[PDB]
């Protein structure tokens, strides 16, 4: 019981001005607003929880209608401290603005 993940929305794709590169997203986690203080979040394992029609889940519990796309923080981005991240899929581009879930794994400190 209790949330064990820092909040984070999905902000866009790693783009130039015309073309975008789909292979790495970039985020905006809630709370960092400077590059100098995002060093905690490098390497943390982040996940995109969403809903769909069948079931397919992993633990001992029976499958229900949730499925996920895992991923990890690659590096920092910009002076204002947002974070780009490379999932093991590409984001569906529907998730623009809706949150992802940055966990507490990869915890060095």
């Amino acid at each position: 019981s209790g949330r064990l993940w820092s909040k984070a929305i999905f902000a866009g794709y790693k783009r130039g001005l015309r073309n975008q590169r789909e292979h790495t997203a970039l985020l905006k986690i809630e709370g960092v607003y400077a590059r100098d203080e995002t060093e905690f979040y490098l390497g943390k394992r982040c996940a995109y929880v969403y809903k769909a029609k069948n079931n397919t889940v992993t633990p001992g519990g029976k499958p229900n209608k949730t499925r996920v796309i895992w991923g990890k923080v690659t590096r920092a981005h910009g002076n204002s401290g947002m974070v780009r991240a490379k999932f093991r899929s590409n984001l569906p581009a529907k998730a623009i603005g809706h949150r992802i879930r940055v966990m507490l794994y990869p915890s060095r400190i």
Binding site: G2, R3, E39, L104, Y105, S107, R108, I109
Partner: protein, 236 residues
């Protein structure tokens, strides 16, 4: 045998050079110029017969496969898992209150005891503050907390090791009949010996906690980020 007789200071660089090592060993007065079985016969056990039979064992193959992939290329020494190294973070010492993150427990504050010969580390909240038994957890899936307690002479039991924490099951069926393995319908009762191993290490963690007042409520609680709770604005 002897010890190294060369202290290291950088990994792979000794402190004494090539000429001074020749004096420390004193190799000048120990320089030197000095200096199959396959099997045997079985008995005969035979009449109208002679000759105890052939030296023959580990014979030829009856059957070669059609093709073979060529042999590997040796690449380097790339030693297996029970031979590498053990490493912990510097902020985990015996008695450091940890935080579970990946488990079924998921946040329960526990007490670190000992990092075994596997990289994983045996760690328990005591059984009467949490419902955490003497489980192993991993290094990188737990957050260490800067509050500590001194269990420097806790006298930790010998026979609990990696081998005491393994999981087992054995296959009788390879055949489509209406059992799902026919032994998975069974709660496990190895617990009738782990209990005796618990209160032989649980019973001396409780008086070590009750020196500091607030702590037996602190292990009772669970860790949770809610609203003003920001890590990197949080000294753990």
């Amino acid at each position: 045998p002897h010890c190294s007789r060369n202290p290291v200071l950088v990994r792979g660089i000794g402190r004494y050079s090539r000429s001074a090592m020749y004096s420390r060993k004193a190799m000048y007065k120990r320089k030197y110029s000095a200096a199959v079985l396959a099997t045997v016969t079985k008995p005969v056990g035979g009449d109208k017969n002679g000759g105890t039979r052939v030296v023959k064992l580990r014979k030829m193959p009856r059957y070669y496969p059609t093709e073979d992939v060529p042999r590997k290329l040796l690449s380097h020494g790339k030693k297996p898992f029970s031979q590498h190294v053990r490493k912990l973070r510097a902020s985990i010492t015996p008695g450091t209150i940890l935080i579970i993150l990946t488990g079924r427990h998921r946040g329960k504050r526990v007490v670190f005891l000992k990092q075994l010969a596997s990289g994983l580390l045996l760690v328990t909240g005591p059984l009467v503050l949490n419902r955490v038994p003497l489980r192993r957890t991993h290094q990188k899936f737990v957050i260490a907390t800067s509050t500590k307690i001194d269990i420097s002479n806790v006298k930790i039991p010998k026979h609990l090791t990696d081998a005491y924490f393994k999981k087992k099951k054995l296959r009788k069926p390879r055949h489509q009949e209406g059992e799902i393995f026919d032994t998975e319908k069974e709660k496990y009762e190895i617990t009738e010996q782990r209990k005796i191993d618990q209160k032989a290490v649980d019973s001396q963690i409780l008086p070590k906690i009750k020196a500091i007042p607030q702590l037996q409520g602190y292990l009772r609680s669970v860790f949770a980020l809610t609203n003003g709770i920001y890590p990197h604005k949080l000294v753990f």
